[PDB]
Amino acid sequence: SGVNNTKKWKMEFDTRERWENPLMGWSSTADPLSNLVLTFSTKEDAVAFAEKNGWSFDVEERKVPKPKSKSYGANFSWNKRTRVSTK
Amino acid sequence: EPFDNSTYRNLQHHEYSTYTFLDLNVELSKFRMPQPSSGRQSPRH
């Protein structure tokens, strides 16, 4: 339930082939840009680092949890169906 | 009719029954005025 991991913009590269070794069988790969994840404090800085390094990008806007009005007294409401049956 | 302070006249509780409380509650229902209505039939309905 913590939110301390949703405060910095991340840059990541699309995944690629990941086969299994003929030996014991780890997850091999041939794409060096597989574990590269970069962190940026603002979208503009992040979107600027992409084409400056020359990388086609797509950007998804930050999802802000909308404020929700919560009242404890609603748990026991005279009329409204929000009255709970257990506590 | 004295100041019979030496007698515990509250003995009616001795000859009570299992259903006594709910019995005279039922007999007492007719005196009660209609209850308020919260609208819906249930908090879930």
Instruction: Say whether B43 and A77 touch across the interface (CB within 8 A).
Output: yes
Instruction: Say whether B39 and A85 touch across the interface (CB within 8 A).
Output: no
Q: What is the DSSP string of A3-70?
A: -TTSSSEEEE-------B-SSS--B----STTS-EEEESSHHHHHHHHHHTT---------PPPP---
Alpha-carbon gap, residue B18 to A32, rounded angstroms: 83
User: CB of A83 within 8 A of CB of B42?
Assistant: no
The Cα-based distances of A32 to A23, A53, A71, B44 in angstroms read 21, 16, 51, 58
Instruction: Say whether B43 and A85 touch across the interface (CB within 8 A).
Output: yes
Residues facing residue A58 across a β-bridge: none
Alpha-carbon gap, residue A40 to A52, rounded angstroms: 14
Resolution of the experimental structure, in angstroms: 3.5
Experimental approach taken: cryo-EM
Alpha-carbon gap, residue A64 to A69, rounded angstroms: 15
Q: How far is A69 from chain B (nearest CA, A)?
A: 21
Nearest to A12 by CA among A30, A48, A38: A38
User: CB of A8 within 8 A of CB of A37?
Assistant: no
